[PDB]
Design a protein around this ligand. Sequence first.
Ligand code: SB4
Lengths: 351, 18
Amino acid sequence: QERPTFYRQELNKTIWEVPERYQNLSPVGSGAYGSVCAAFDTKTGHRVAVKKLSRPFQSIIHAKRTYRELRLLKHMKHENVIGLLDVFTPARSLEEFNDVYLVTHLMGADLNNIVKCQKLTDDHVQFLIYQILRGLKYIHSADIIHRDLKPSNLAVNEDCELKILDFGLARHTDDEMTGYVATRWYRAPEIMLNWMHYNQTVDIWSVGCIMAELLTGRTLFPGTDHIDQLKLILRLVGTPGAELLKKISSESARNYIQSLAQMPKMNFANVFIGANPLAVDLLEKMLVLDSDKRITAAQALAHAYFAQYHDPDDEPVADPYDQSFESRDLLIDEWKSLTYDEVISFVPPPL
Amino acid sequence: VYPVSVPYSSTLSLVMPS
Ligand SMILES: Nc1nccc(-c2c(-c3ccc(F)cc3)ncn2C2CCNCC2)n1
């Protein structure tokens, strides 16, 4: 293994310097802290997506996050999760190391694009939610939570295959959080304001939201702010008891909810008109306020809505992930050096 | 009320936006 030959061009207003294996680069939109180009890879013969990070080491927080993202992508080997075909830098030494490029298989679109242009049949929804859940079982088994499941974060292709991306990258103390508007719509009530008490089933709430939207074409709870969001949610699931309501509300929001009459539980079969009774039933197990009674990814996969796909011996869990780095405090150049190590130690898929 | 796109009646493909 010697250094490949690289070539340069300008895409999205920077110089992209990539191995000559990647041809026909085409900008196909932003990624998390980066931008993405589609390409053909002469080496595997696949169409791929290449993400170049935007100023990966511009602060300590950014550098760590660059490290976190690389470590996550390297760990994930699962058909319904984005993984790495390649990671490269044009740098020949740590002393010149500035840029990180990540490569995975090309997916044609995201579920935002699909929901906004096309009606989905109950069969589509079955296979799509199944893949989300299959992927999520695997992520959750490595003690990672996605935290931001929404349609734009679910990549799809022409054969209705799906991969989860942008898992576990953001934290709620991050500034200029992009995507925050859409993220609210899909977020579990218990973490809408603080994160002092939650579990991995925050992600299953988001799945419930996405599923409803794939079935109907419409965003289930498109709130304008924390009070509005809560009101929209309670209008469907019903106003809970006083102890639970306190766990999911600010004092202000709680006061707004209580200035209105108690809302009863709606029967989901009278909301989602025309739906598969089994689709309705699973939604009822996903969109529940009590997170200790919300269904897990593993349990959801055995739900009868997924009878045509479910298979316990073909729904794998992950190798154990070392998140000890998360507790560290390092300077830009130290996170950089760690990220460099990870770039250099990468071993590609066999193909 | 949120009627489904395609009412349920007792290989898959998707079209890309472009
Ligand atoms: N078309 C396509 N196919 C696969 C992935 C992506 C991709 C990535 C991404 C992540 C890691 C990686 F190593 C390479 C690319 N990040 C955001 N996206 C897209 C998903 C949302 N719309 C376009 C951006 N885009």
